[PDB]
Write an enzyme that holds these catalytic residues in place. Structure first.
Site, PDB file in Angstrom:
ATOM      1  N   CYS A 194       0.903  -1.321  -0.127  1.00 57.95           N
ATOM      2  CA  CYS A 194      -0.004  -0.114   0.070  1.00 57.95           C
ATOM      3  C   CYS A 194       0.934   1.198   0.100  1.00 57.95           C
ATOM      4  CB  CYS A 194      -0.926   0.122   1.147  1.00 57.95           C
ATOM      5  SG  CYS A 194      -2.241   0.931   1.076  1.00 57.95           S
ATOM      6  N   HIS A 204      -0.142   1.406  -3.364  1.00 56.30           N
ATOM      7  CA  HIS A 204      -1.423   2.080  -3.752  1.00 56.30           C
ATOM      8  C   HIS A 204      -1.431   3.060  -4.746  1.00 56.30           C
ATOM      9  CE1 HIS A 204      -5.231   4.052  -2.966  1.00 56.30           C
ATOM     10  NE2 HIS A 204      -5.645   2.942  -2.198  1.00 56.30           N
TER      11      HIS A 204
END
EC number: 3.1.2.-
Lengths: 188, 188
Positions: B105, B125
């Site tokens: 992420c 991400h």
């Protein structure tokens, strides 16, 4: 005007099935209370993650009512939920007022123990089916998430995102659930 | 003969990205230490779940080396990881000994801060891409899980199961990862 969720956290609960719904519900602006069954002390979950509850269940019960009561799974967690008279009282009150009850994996077996929602279609973890079906009081489903009136059930750790988004859709609507879903990078 | 994983837990970490890999790795029989960046005190994560670490990072560092070092995401968690000199030292030691580094992420942006694995293919991400690509030191990928040598990256909360199973496959093999996957009830 904010919705309110109670998540009941017992020793032995499945920590993925606890944290995913709490996090996703808070992303949706729901006010979540994580209440410890045994008090306010930290809870050792099934794979030894230790989570600190927000409140004891005795205190959270006084700040009801809640728009949803959430029961995580984990075999030993669900057995602790099933044996608790305080849980029985919360669930009977929720069913009487026609509030949502949501349970995942082994969690639905506590509905049977407390005689909640007899006659509903439910699902569980495959390994919990025989326990849930003792007596024939529910109809079994293999859908990943099942919803029959006010009883919402789901199957296992890997269905936890779908289960949490179903709770969001039930309380806040399809558009909020779609908005919350997009930044998570879910496959489907 | 048991493999060993270090998970570094900072204030602001994404709690789903922390608990899913810890739980899945322990299902695979890996010995996991959840180490608090700031000490042994409970850590407040990004959506206010409070997790108690197993050890402080200072103590866990002394019990190395680890077969994998795992960096969760969460924007503020990753910023705390990026600013920490103790993290820099752990990652440089892991890269020097050719151990696995795994980050999800926002977590991979700490690799850039500490100058780890330049020249590798990575993912993050979508909202963290521009930060990761400052200077052109990595090649970007949109795969849900990316692995280039000893750097393993993944994209977001919804890819956390795939990321954890990739760690299991890297350390314990495909057969163990398949055995651990089946009871989770994952879709694909």
């Amino acid at each position: 005007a904010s919705k309110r969720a109670l998540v009941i956290l017992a020793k032995g609960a499945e920590e993925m099935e606890t944290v995913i719904p709490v996090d996703v519900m808070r992303r949706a602006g729901i006010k979540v209370t994580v209440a410890g069954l045994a008090g306010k002390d930290p809870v050792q979950c099934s794979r030894d993650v230790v989570i600190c509850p927000d409140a004891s269940l005795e205190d959270a019960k006084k700040e009801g009512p809640y728009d949803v009561v959430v029961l995580p799974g984990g075999n030993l967690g669900a057995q602790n939920l099933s044996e608790s008279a305080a849980v029985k009282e919360i669930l009977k009150e929720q069913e009487n007022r026609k509030g949502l009850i949501a349970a995942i994996c082994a969690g639905p077996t506590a509905l049977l123990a407390h005689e909640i929602g007899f006659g509903s279609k439910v699902t569980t973890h495959p390994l919990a089916k025989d326990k849930m079906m003792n007596g024939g009081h529910y109809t079994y489903s293999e859908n990943r998430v099942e919803k029959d009136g006010l009883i919402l059930t789901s199957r296992g750790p890997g269905t936890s995102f779908e289960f949490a988004l179903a709770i969001v859709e039930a309380l806040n609507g399809k558009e909020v659930a779609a908005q919350v879903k997009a930044p998570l990078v879910l496959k489907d």
